[PDB]
Amino acid sequence: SGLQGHIIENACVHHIKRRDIVLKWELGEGAFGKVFLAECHNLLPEQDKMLVAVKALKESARQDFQREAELLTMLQHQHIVRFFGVCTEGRPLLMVFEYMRHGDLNRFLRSHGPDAKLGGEDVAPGPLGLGQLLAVASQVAAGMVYLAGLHFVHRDLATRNCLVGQGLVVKIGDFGMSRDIYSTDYYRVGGRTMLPIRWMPPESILYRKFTTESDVWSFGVVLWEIFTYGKQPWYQLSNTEAIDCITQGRELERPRACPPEVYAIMRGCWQREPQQRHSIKDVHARLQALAQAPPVYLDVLGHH
Ligand SMILES: Cc1ccc(NC(=O)c2ccc(C(F)(F)F)cc2F)c(-c2ccc(F)cc2)n1
Numbered sequence: 001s002g003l004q005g006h007i008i009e010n011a012c013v014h015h016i017k018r019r020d021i022v023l024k025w026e027l028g029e030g031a032f033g034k035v036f037l038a039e040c041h042n043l044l045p046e047q048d049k050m051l052v053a054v055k056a057l058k059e060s061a062r063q064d065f066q067r068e069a070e071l072l073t074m075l076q077h078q079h080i081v082r083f084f085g086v087c088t089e090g091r092p093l094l095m096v097f098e099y100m101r102h103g104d105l106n107r108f109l110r111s112h113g114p115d116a117k118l119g120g121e122d123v124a125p126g127p128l129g130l131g132q133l134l135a136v137a138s139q140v141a142a143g144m145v146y147l148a149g150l151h152f153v154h155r156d157l158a159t160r161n162c163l164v165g166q167g168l169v170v171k172i173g174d175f176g177m178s179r180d181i182y183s184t185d186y187y188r189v190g191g192r193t194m195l196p197i198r199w200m201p202p203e204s205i206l207y208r209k210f211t212t213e214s215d216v217w218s219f220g221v222v223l224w225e226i227f228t229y230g231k232q233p234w235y236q237l238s239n240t241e242a243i244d245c246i247t248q249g250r251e252l253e254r255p256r257a258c259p260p261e262v263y264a265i266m267r268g269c270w271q272r273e274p275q276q277r278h279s280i281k282d283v284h285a286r287l288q289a290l291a292q293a294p295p296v297y298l299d300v301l302g303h304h
Pocket of ligand 1: 068
């Protein structure tokens with residue numbers, strides 16, 4: 001449950017008046033609640049009014065909301081979805097986040113991939129270029145560095161759990177609806193429990209262990225998703241065949257658009273032994289340089 005997992009190991013929360021939040025329309029809905037585009041007044045200076053994404057809590061779940069909001073208030077970084085605070089006067093209780101114009105990273109990758117149907121404000125016509133793909137991956141890594149820095153275990157790192165804003169700014173974050181919107185990205189064990197198996201290392205599938213290291217493995221899989229324009233990992237396999245391949249040491253193939261150097265960052269996250277796995281700091285440091293490298297050096301990395 002991500003935020004919940006960090007709470008089960010271990011207020012500065014900003015409050016917003018209901019009259020300062022004006023609900024416009026729904027963006028999505030699930031089981032834990034729904035998301036609305038809203039207009040927020042007197043939130044930030046030199047703006048007066050601004051657009052935000054509002055999570056409306058759908059029982060003794062009100063206490064959960066408060067600790068989640070406390071955790072979200074602490075979790076502030078350039079590549080973590082900005083949390084503005086809560087509205088606790090009257091029901092439904094709301095969490096207020098920034099509005100991310102391009103939506104989740106998976107949706108954005110596929111819409112700028114070779115399988116997209118078809119204007120070009122933040123990015124060029126046709127599929128994303130190498131430079132665009134690298135900057136994307138680096139921001140996700142930066143965000144994961146801040147999380148390993150604060151010693152936070154995500155448990156569900158995937159491009160569907162990242163968001164894209166104006167000027168191609170990518171941040172880790174979701175509104176708790178991935179299980180409803182991307183149900184095929186989870187394996188239903190029984191009753192309620194749904195696991196993102198295609199993104200999980202052998203110790204999370206086999207031993208049910210979740211760490212900072214199972215999170216670097218997921219990043220490796222996120223790196224693969226970036227270079228395949230949001231394709232589902234092990235798409236050719238059923239849930240049981242995918243569990244089998246992961247537990248039997250199989251590695252995901254090198255994507256077409258992926259340079260051997262980027263594939264080496266991936267393979268480093270995919271070491272069977274959690275200890276052997278490369279730290280997120282170095283995975284990020286390796287990606288920052290690859291992203292901020294001259295086009296002369298970049299063009300020699302991408303062939304054909
Ligand atoms: C059922 C479910 C599953 C997963 C969720 N996401 C998280 O726990 C999560 C969100 C954000 C970040 C980061 F890094 F951006 F700070 C890290 C995370 F692990 C949620 C969720 C619950 C409350 C909420 F305000 C937002 C999302 N709910």
